Amino acid sequence: APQQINDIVHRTITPLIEQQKIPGMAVAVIYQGKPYYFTWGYADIAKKQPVTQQTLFELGSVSKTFTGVLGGDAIARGEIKLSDPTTKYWPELTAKQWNGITLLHLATYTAGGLPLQVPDEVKSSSDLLRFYQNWQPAWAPGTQRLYANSSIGLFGALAVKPSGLSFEQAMQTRVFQPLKLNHTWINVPPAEEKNYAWGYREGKAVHVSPGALDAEAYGVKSTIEDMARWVQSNLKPLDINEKTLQQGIQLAQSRYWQTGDMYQGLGWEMLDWPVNPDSIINNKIALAARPVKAITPPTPAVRASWVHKTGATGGFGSYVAFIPEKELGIVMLANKNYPNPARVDAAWQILNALQ
Template identity: 45%
Template sequence: MNYQPKYLVSALLLLSGSCMAATDMRQVVDSNVKPLMQQQDIPGLSVAVINQGKVQYFNYGVAAKDTQAAVSQNTLFEIGSVSKTFTATLGGYAQAIDKLRLSDKASLYLPSLVGSAFDRISLLQLATYTAGGLPLQFPQASDSATTMLGYFQHWKPTYAAGEQRLYSNPSIGLFGYLTAQSLGQPFNVAMEKTLLPKLGLTNTYVSVRTDKASQYAQGYDKQQKPVHVSPGALDSEAYGLKTTSQDLARYVIANMHPQTLEQPMQQAIAATHAGYYTVNGMTQGLGWERYPYPITLQALIDGNSTPMAMEPHKVTWLNPPQAQPANVLYNKTGSTGGFGAYVAYVPSKDMGVVILANKNYPNAERVKVAHAILSAMDQ
């Protein structure tokens, strides 16, 4: 697939050295998104471009083929694993108000895990996918609210805790579940009634309200069949949020300007931005994944590649955890059966991008579009 013409647009804008006007950004986004939607057969897509505290929205296509409802910045999309950054922020908040410590062993927060492998696995290791080999997904027989605790009670690590990163929904999902236990609330309540309001997000949900159903985009699978995310064990904690490009833009701004939030939320965001270990050029935060900035397109593609998600990688811990450096890029991809999401931002440049689509498509293609947009802004 040849993206050279699109990146030429970005390069010309970079060389111009002038402030980017709205018409220039429209040209950059259009020239990246329109070919992508055609090539990947994406019905609808919403982009939010954040630059110096201002947000521009670029919306394309339809939220649902049957109604032909146009996508807008208020269209609700499933964001898949971008949800993990919210789960991580909730954990950081619980730590900030002294309800948990990331260094605590997991079984401390759930009596039914006492005597299991989780006597020796910390909350931090769960949150950073280093518990010892928890898989990407639950085995089918354990993928329900009634069977998942039995799975954890009998699970045996493949590696010593803290040695290997293996990206895992059960791992960070259990972290979210235990965080909610520490707060004395069900996870969905803690997310919707505590965290999201503190972030100023008014159109983000674990369960989409009935009065918002008409804003909920229809997802489409590879065969263009309609699909929404299926229920599963720890789905809310690992991949369950639905939100809009407008709310995600607010979320990015909150991450880049946490001083606008109350003190515990500032501490929560600092915890998610800290670097806990490095692997293959990526520094693992809580939920967020961090890279030195500026970054090449290929390095960002590699960091969001299938091997990074599917294979174990030996990690090098940072002791103590490294606070946010001066020039870094944070990002996270997310997918469900019918949706694809990507968020990336550079705090030192006060710029970011959100890309939401109602079809799952390759991470590399999301990264290419975001990198071109960020490059065009960074003049």
């Protein structure tokens, strides 16, 4: 890397690793449309396997950015509309609380208080129907935002219904393959297991457990190289040859709702750039319910934004942020779930220095 990039990254990340006791970390900086990679420590402590540019990390809730873009691509294809009732794609969802709940509400966590987690007891398609049928909203649709796997997860599942494809096949064919993300997986193949980092929770090696709507909400594993490519694709969607994918990326960075200084996209969240970390900061909170104002109609992707998404699984902590107007971005992947504020601080320190 240019020494400036080398220096800010190492001087920021080394102390972070030390203070958070992170076993293994990979970082990519995207600078004027080129990636620079950095790696530290261990993918597998017991087997002494180092983190490399090929190591797979669990993305946790950064997976939702892929779901949002896949949804955008389905909109661009004319397969679904965000204004469509949920019941259009799930006619068995007959309970009257669903009247007025649209795909937009599911995608943006504004359906009226869908829970953070789909319960463990929910496995089958029958169990899932019963869960959503029995759910009672605290609020009218489109009044409050409550971050929820059960919300964008259902959006993901319904968005692919018209295609006839499984969610995984849709994601592979319509997003991973066109973008050449050849080492990004919803299910890690046996051939790739050599590269799959262990996550660490209280010193114990752990991988994410299967769950209902996992693929849609938190199911992606990827390398630092592919995630750099994902950030490039989201920085510069006009470089993408596939027309509906190009439009889908754009739709996912549209601003649909505002709360405080933040705007909700599809998966992606955005603030106006410039911004300081304390406002970006503003999972220690298990549940934060926030009133939202509708942006009517949605503002197309603003180039002067800090666009970002935090992710966690039991054993992993990921962070991605980019600023389109500066052609600048960062991906931080770690095999420990360490505090979100420390991620934003480090990312901002790096990006502010290169900006």
